[PDB]
Amino acid sequence: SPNLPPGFDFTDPAIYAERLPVAEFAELRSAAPIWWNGQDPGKGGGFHDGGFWAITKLNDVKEISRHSDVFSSYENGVIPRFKNDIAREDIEVQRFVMLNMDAPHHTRLRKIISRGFTPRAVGRLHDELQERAQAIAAEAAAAGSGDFVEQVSCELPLQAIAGLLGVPQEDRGKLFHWSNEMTGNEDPEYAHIDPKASSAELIGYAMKMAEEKAKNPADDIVTQLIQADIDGEKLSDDEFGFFVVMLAVAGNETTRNSITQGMMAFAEHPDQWELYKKVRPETAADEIVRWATPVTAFQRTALRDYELSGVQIAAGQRVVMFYRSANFDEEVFQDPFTFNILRNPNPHVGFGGTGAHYCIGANLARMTINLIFNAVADHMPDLKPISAPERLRSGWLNGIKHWQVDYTG
Ligand code: HEM
Ligand SMILES: CCOC(=O)c1cc2cc(-c3ccncc3)ccc2n1CC1CCCC1
């Protein structure tokens, strides 16, 4: 057996509020790459089936992610942990967003929404995001010190979402408020947030925006999404509203935490930080994502019996892909535990395994990371941390709530 405590759960929020279970992930990769992770009664993060299969190897993650005909996202959602007492109804509302849909409903939705993540559309965000990144850094440096997460990591990913959706300036304040109130409620610091409230307001704003853009068409990404194409396909108003609700999560706390941990990695590896400031290599973004793995894990449900790397997975059983483990697989990376911002190629699964659900925002994310870290180098090159970062209590998100930091040194 793999050497692990009894009653160990890799989706336990208690661990991730403290640390990442890196030694435990390494143990499984070596001794039990696919491992039944049982869960005590009542302690199933919202799922009362007794446990799941841990998936720790990159190739195993990639097999599951491409075989979405077997490994469903609809059946139980992809989030592997909620509050233990969460109602089944609240899990199943996730199916209203593309992420938790299967083919063919996902296939139709992904093809329409692809019209918003063309390389061309993302490039029109470059200039506005670059200028904001620069001012965010200058504003942060001028403060001398403070919470790096709030002052450097927080704002720009939200600007990318708002700029992509063309949200007018005056509306961005409440849009950021709602977007930031969607996850993390298992952490004591956010016990009082109601995601369903903010989501219903997000959908209302998103649907009103889509009604208005129909009446007054433009050359935005919104109007391309709600008016029909060759096949007569388009998002109806509520579907656009579920698209916005998804964007408010999928591209917010993820890029946020990659910026933070990416800076956390440059503190720990001064060699890489000195190198970065000199060459500003855009390969850093991928290494920063591999290092940060903002989504520790996503799950699937096997719709039929399936044999994966010599392990019989039974219909209805859950498999949880631990991207945190896959991104440090010794069989795929030379030195996984070397932060190397020049690593090329870099086949990390930070954006998920390739397949139907592979992150549509991967290139926007990489651009956001590259702009903000260029701005950090321009305005805050001698960044020194004050105190140790404060981790987020979450079973699937690898979050940093706060990080006290001096920008002058
Ligand atoms: C910056 C770090 C990011 C990380 C680590 C990340 C990670 C992921 C992962 C793991 C998936 C699921 C992969 C799979 O199931 O195969 C995903 C899907 C998705 N991501 Fe991201 N993401 C990031 C940024 C973004 C951004 C900036 C956006 C949009 C502005 C975005 C939008 C989406 C959407 C819409 C999906 C659903 C795709 C589908 O189900 O067809 N993500 N992301
Ligand atoms: C209106 C229907 O949608 C929602 O309420 C909703 C969508 C959603 C998406 C993510 C997500 C996470 C990671 N990468 C992409 C998307 C996370 C949470 C989400 N919730 C709220 C949940 C909290 C408990 C109830 C469900």
Q: Where are the domains of the chain?
A: 1-409
Helix, strand, or coil (residue 240): helix
Question: Is the distance from the beta carbon of residue 249 to the nearest atom of ligand 2 less than 6 Å?
Answer: yes
100 Ramachandran zone, left/alpha/beta (phi>0; psi -120 to 50)? alpha
Q: For residue 2, say if its preceding peptide bond is cis, omega within 30 degrees of 0.
A: no
Is residue 226 within 8 A of residue 213, CB to CB? The reply is yes
Å from CA of 3 to ligand 2 middle: 35
Nearest CA among 95, 96, 117, 359 for reference residue 203: 96
User: 154 among the known binding-site residues?
Assistant: no
Torsion of CA 187, 193, 199, 204, to 10 degrees: -160
Q: How many residues does the chain have?
A: 409
Resolution (A): 2.5
* Closest ligand to residue 260's CA: 1
Containing H/E element for 285? helix 283-292
Q: Rounded distance, CA 239 to CA 218, Å? A: 19
Sign of CA dihedral 330, 335, 339, 344: negative
Helix, strand, or coil (residue 302): strand
Q: Which residues pair with 302 in a beta bridge?
A: 71
Is residue 392 within 8 A of residue 401, CB to CB? The reply is yes
Å from CA of 180 to ligand 2 middle: 12
Nearest CA among 333, 398, 339 for reference residue 26: 333
Containing H/E element for 199? helix 195-215
Q: Beta strand pairing status for 51-55 and 318-322?
A: parallel
* Closest ligand to residue 91's CA: 2
As given in the structure block, the two tokens for residue 103 are: 């083919």
Helix, strand, or coil (residue 198): helix
Q: How was this structure determined?
A: X-ray
